[PDB]
Amino acid sequence: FGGYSERHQANPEFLNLAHYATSTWSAQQPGKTHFDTVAEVVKVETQVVAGTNYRLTLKVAESTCELTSTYNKDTCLPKADAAHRTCTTVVFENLQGDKSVSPFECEAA
Amino acid sequence: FGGYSERHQANPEFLNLAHYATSTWSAQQPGKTHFDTVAEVVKVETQVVAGTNYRLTLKVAESTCELTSTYNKDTCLPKADAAHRTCTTVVFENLQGDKSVSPFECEAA
Fold first, then answer.
1. List the disulfide bonds (chains A, B).
2. What is the CATH number of the domain that holds B88?
């Protein structure tokens, strides 16, 4: 139940949302003189998105482990030589436990 | 309230998320031969995500209304001779009512 579920016609919620989307989108394209509108709602699917976003500011450094090996935090320790970099990421974690890791942004200094 | 609430080093779960994020991200990085790891969890901000994703399949048509004007589902009807296109889009809506629209992926046909 983490994916979409088909529906729909017997509710204006979906229609009024199709209109929103279509005027919103088409009022930004090039070559456009008119709003686009809805000729027909063909299919509707809903999917609940619930979880929590983890914005992590981190000191990051080259570890002792090679990419060829399986990463373990207890033994892939930070190299005493390595430069520390201040980095930011967001990790999203829905109820299922599935995580996605936004691309690290790091201060260049 | 609808944004990042701060928290953080004492907490194992945040530490585990920081290792997951770091190991995962740096693996996919080019040039890199070793894993990056966590020297330090500096800051942790969380953020509850609640909403519904609406995937829409639509028939779209040029409307009677100019872009220089206020769209109205009841006034901006589809032009009688306008070609219809089958378009897909997702519309997220948070618990507040604030909506986002993915770019309409139309159909080449």
1. 65-76, 87-106
2. 3.10.450.10
